[model samples]
Target: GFKQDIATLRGDLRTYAQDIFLAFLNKYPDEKRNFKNYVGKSDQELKSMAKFGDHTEKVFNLMMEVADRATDCVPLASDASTLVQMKQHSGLTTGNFEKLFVALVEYMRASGQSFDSQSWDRFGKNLVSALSSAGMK
Candidate 1:
C-alpha cells in the first residue's frame, strides 16, 4: 500500500508539485522570504516563472528520492553536501522539511487523494531524520 501510494504520488509529480507549493506558501507565507526570486512576486507571476517550476520540480525530485528509500534512508548521507549547500543558501531547517511534508500531505488530502497515513508518517520521519543527519539546522 505504501509503495502503491508512492506510485500514485509519483504518477503526477508535476501537478502535485505546483499544488503543494501553493499550499505551503499559503500556509506559511512568511517562508517566502527564502525564495529570493519569489519574494515580492505575486502568486500568478511566480507560477508563470519557469524558474519557479524548476525549483518545485527539483524539490519534488528530492521528496521522491527520499520516498523511494523511506525505510532505509541512511543512504541520504550521500546528500549531506547538497543539504548543506541548501542550508547555506536558504537557511533550511529540519522544521522546514517537516512543514513541507505536512503541506504535501494536507494538499493530497484536500484534493481527494488517498494516502496511507502510516506510510506518510514513516516517510516524514525519515525525511526529517535524513535532513537532520545531513547537518541541516
Candidate 2:
C-alpha cells in the first residue's frame, strides 16, 4: 500500500511539475531560450530536479510528458475548499505539501517565470479555475 501510494504521489508530483512548466510557457510566450534550456537538460537532471530524489524520477518523467503535451497551464486554486481538496488528493503530508508548493513556485521563479504580488493573486484565481475545470473536489 505504501508503495502504490508513493507511486501515485510521485505521479501527481510530476503532473504538478508539468503544470508549472506550462504556466511558465503561458507567462512567457516569446521565451524560446528558457524552453530550449530545459530541453537541453538530460532527462536524469530534469527527473532529479522534479522529485528531489532518485526514486521519484518516474513520477517526474510523467509530469515532463504532461508538460510536453500541454498547450496551456494555470495556477492551482488557493481557496480553503480548493486547498483542502488539493491536500486530500495529493496525499502529501502537511510538511511535504507546503514544501512542494514552495518548491514549485520557487522553481518557476528560478526558471524565469515572472511574478509579483499581483501575480500571486492572479495565480490563486487561475488555480481555482484550473482545478474546478479539472473536476477536482
Candidate 3:
C-alpha cells in the first residue's frame, strides 16, 4: 500500500513537473533550455557536461532529481496505527499544498540559477502580448 501510494504520487509529481516546464518554456521560448527532453536522459549522461555540450545539463539534472525525490519518498506504515499518521501527513489540506508549492519553488530556484526578477517581469509583459495576440486577454 505504501508503494502504491508512492507510485500514485510519483505520477502526479511527474505531471506537475511537466506542467511547470511547459509554463517556463512558454514564457521563455528562446531560452534554449528544454526540460522535458533533458529530463529523460540517463543519470550518467545527465551528469556528463560533454554529453550535453553545455552547463545547462547540470541545472536540468537538479530539477529532475528534485522531481524524482518528490515522487520517491514513501511513508512507512505498520498495522492500522500508521495509517492514521500517513493520512495526517498526506491529506489534501492547505498545509500540504503550501509545502508542495515551496518544494517546487525551491527546485526551480536551484535548477535555474537565481530567479531572474527582470526576466520574470519581461515574461509577464510578453505573456500579456501573447494573450492579446490570441484575442484571449
Candidate 4:
C-alpha cells in the first residue's frame, strides 16, 4: 500500500517538502517559536533560507525512511534512540507528532498523490508505540 506510493513521493521530494512544512506550520503556528532560526521569519523568508531547506530535506528523508520501514513491517532501532533523545530534549509529545503526519497526509492528498492514508497512520501508530514503550509519552 505504501511502497509504490512512497516511491512516487520520493520522485517529488523537492517539490513537496516546502509545502508540507508550510502546511504543518499552518496547523500549529505556535510551534514555530521553538525553532530559533525560524522564530521571526515569515513564510516567504523561511523559504529563502538555506537552513530551512536543509530542515525540509531532513524532515522529508525521515518521513521517507519510516514509511519504507513501515511498509516492510520493520521495527525501528537507532531511530527510536534518536527519537527518545528528542523526546527528552524537547519535551515533545506524541500528539504533535501525530498531527505532524496528519499535515503530511493532507498535503500529499492536496498534491493529488496516491497513498493509502491508513498506511501512513499505520506507520504513525507503529512509531508512537515504539516511542511510548520507550517512555516518550
Candidate 5:
C-alpha cells in the first residue's frame, strides 16, 4: 500500500522537488547559497538537478525512506527519533519543512489541480509535530 503510494507520488516528487526549490529560492533568496551548485543553471537544468543529480537523488531518496518508516519514528511525549535524526542530518529545518509543504501545495494548485489534498495536510502536520519534539518555535 505505502509502496504503491510511493510510486504514485514519485513522478510528482521529482517535479515538485524543483518547484519547491524554485519557490524557496524566490521566497528566501538567502537560501540560494545553500544550493550554490545550482547558481548558474537554467530553470530546467536546476529542476533536473534535484531529479538526476547525485547527492540530490540520495537525499530525496532518503526522504522516501523516512516517510516509509515514519511510523517507527513516532515519539512518546518527548523529543527526537530516528526520523528527526534523518531530517537533521539532511539539514532540514522546521522552517524548511513548512516552506516545502506550502510551496508544493501552491505549485499544485497553480497547475490547475483542484482541492482535497488530505495527504499533504496530514503528513505535513505529522512531520512538523514529529520534528518539533525538540521544541521548535
Candidate 6:
C-alpha cells in the first residue's frame, strides 16, 4: 500500500537527495548548519556542502527501508526510530528534507510509477506524520 510509492524512489535516492539538499540550501540561505551536523560539515560534498552526503545516504536509506516495509510488515518501528533521530539530530526548519519528499513524488511520476490518488494522496503527509509521531514517541 504505502510501500509502493517509495519503492519507486530506490533507483535515484542519492541523486534525489542531492537535488533536494541543494534546494534546501537555496531555500534557506541563512542557515549555515543542520542540527545533524558533524563539525558543521556533511560527510561528503553535496550541492551546498560536503558532510551532507553521509547524512543524506543514511536518512534516505532509512526512509526507503521504512516505506518498503510498510507494505505488509513491521515497518513503523524503524521508521519511528529514524523519525525520532531526525528530531534529535536534524533541524526541522530546513526545507531540504521536505524538498526531498516532494521531489520524490515528482520523480515517481516522471519515472512512470503509477499512483492513483488513493495510493499516494497521503504519501507525503503520512511520512511527515510518521516522523512527527516518531518524534513524539
Q: What's each prediction's TM-score?
A: 0.80, 0.30, 0.22, 0.82, 0.61, 0.55
Which parts of model 1 are misplaced by more than 4 Å? 40-42, 72-75, 79-82, 85-90
Which residue ranges in model 5 land beyond 4 Å of their true spot?
Answer: 1-5, 11-13, 47-52, 70-80, 86-92, 112-116, 134-137
After superposition, the stretches of candidate 2 with alpha carbons farther than 4 Å from their true spots are 1-55, 74-102, 108-128
Best model number under lDDT: 4
Q: Of the candidates numbered 2 and 5, which has the greater TM-score value?
A: 5
Q: Candidate 2: which pairs clash?
A: 14-63, 75-127, 76-127, 77-127, 77-128
**Tens digit of per-residue lDDT, candidate 6, span 4-103:** 5465456777776665555545444554455334334442444355456667666677766766666443346566565657545455622344455565
Clashing pairs in 3: none
lDDT value for candidate 1? 0.71
lDDT of 3 by residue, 4-48 (tens): 422433455534444444344444444223244555454345435
Candidate order by decreasing TM-score: 4, 1, 5, 6, 2, 3
Better model by lDDT: candidate 1 vs candidate 5: 1
Clashes of each: 0, 5, 0, 0, 0, 7
96 Cα displacement, candidate 3 (Å): 29
Cα displacement (angstroms), candidate 3, residue 83, comes to: 37
lDDT of 6: 0.54
Clash pairs detected, candidate 1: none
Candidate 3 Cα outliers beyond 4 Å, as residue runs: 1-11, 33-137
Model 5, 14-64: lDDT tens per residue?
555555557656666666556667677766776565433545445556556
lDDT of each: 0.71, 0.42, 0.36, 0.72, 0.57, 0.54
Model 5 pairs whose backbones collide: none
